């Protein structure tokens, strides 16, 4: 998986920086030019998503009593189910990650900092393993960045 490790490192970092509230000081070295650009975009849009839907988000994080790793694998599924209607777009995609972030904050909050990495993987695994050909038809992370340019 060439352009998946690039997705993985994007989601892990956004989620880690959100949980830890501070930006990481090490360069994002396995996403390169393409992937660092989208992190800049993701930070921008995902923080608005989080801020715009803070109540909706909070409502859902409640219902999914989120503790161990299986709760994470379970959430992965919910996310798979989002796209069942046959529709794929970045709004969805980003919203999925923004929620990751939200949840990841909660995880560090409830002393489960180490469930944040399994969470990142599933999100990545969800998208890339289920929506490979949609992602590809958009020039991947480049499309993400051009969608949210504004």
């Amino acid at each position: 998986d060439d352009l998946y490790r690039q997705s993985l490192e994007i989601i892990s970092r956004y989620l880690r920086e959100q949980a830890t509230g501070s930006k990481d000081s090490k360069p994002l070295g396995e996403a390169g030019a393409a992937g660092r650009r989208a992190l800049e975009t993701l930070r921008r849009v995902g923080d608005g998503v989080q801020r715009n839907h803070e109540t909706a988000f909070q409502g859902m994080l409640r219902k999914l009593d989120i503790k161990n790793e299986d709760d994470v694998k379970s959430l992965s599924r919910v996310m798979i189910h989002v796209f069942s209607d046959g529709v794929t777009n970045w709004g969805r995609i980003v919203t999925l990650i923004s929620f990751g972030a939200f949840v990841a904050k909660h995880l560090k909050t409830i002393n489960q900092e180490s469930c944040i990495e399994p969470l990142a993987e599933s999100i990545t695994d969800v998208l890339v393993r289920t929506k490979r050909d949609w992602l590809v038809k958009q020039r991947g992370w480049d499309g993400f960045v051009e969608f949210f340019h504004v």
Partner: peptide
């Protein structure tokens, strides 16, 4: 996600941008 909340937010985030592009 009994009520399609995340999808519907996804689509709203997509709508707002669409109307911005």
């Amino acid at each position: 996600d009994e009520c399609a909340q995340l999808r519907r937010i996804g689509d709203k985030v997509n709508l707002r941008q669409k109307l911005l592009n």
